[PDB]
Write a protein that binds this ligand. Structure first.
Ligand SMILES: *[C@@H]1O[C@H](CO)[C@@H](O)[C@H](O)[C@H]1NC(C)=O
Lengths: 50, 49
């Protein structure tokens, strides 16, 4: 899973078998650290028009 | 992959296959290339109940 985002702590609960974690779209709104098996909360970097 | 979606539901059986919703979580996804086209359960217990 290669992408760009703001990795952050997630309060979400990924049931044991739950590897990744898309949302109402297709965006991996969360990942489980290969190591440390932690539920991260990948979110896109803050862009915006100027 | 021989998936075994098991939910050991901790609910009562007032009646069989009761109503409600019980999602099943996979327990073992056995990778094996095999053609199962039959099936059978076992009670082999010596003191078969
Ligand atoms: C598996 O066994 C069935 C029953 O004999 C047979 O019809 C089927 O073709 C077999 N599958 C494979 C791997 O060809």
């Amino acid at each position: 899973l290669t992408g760009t985002g703001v990795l952050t702590e997630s309060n979400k609960k990924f049931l044991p078998f739950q590897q990744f974690g898309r949302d109402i779209a297709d965006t991996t709104d969360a990942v489980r650290d290969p190591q440390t098996l932690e539920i991260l909360d990948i979110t896109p970097c803050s862009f915006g028009g100027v | 992959y021989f998936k075994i979606y098991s939910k050991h539901t901790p609910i009562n059986l007032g009646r069989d296959l009761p109503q409600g919703f019980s999602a099943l979580e996979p327990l073992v996804d056995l990778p094996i290339g095999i053609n199962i086209t039959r099936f059978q359960t076992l009670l082999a217990l010596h003191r078969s109940y």
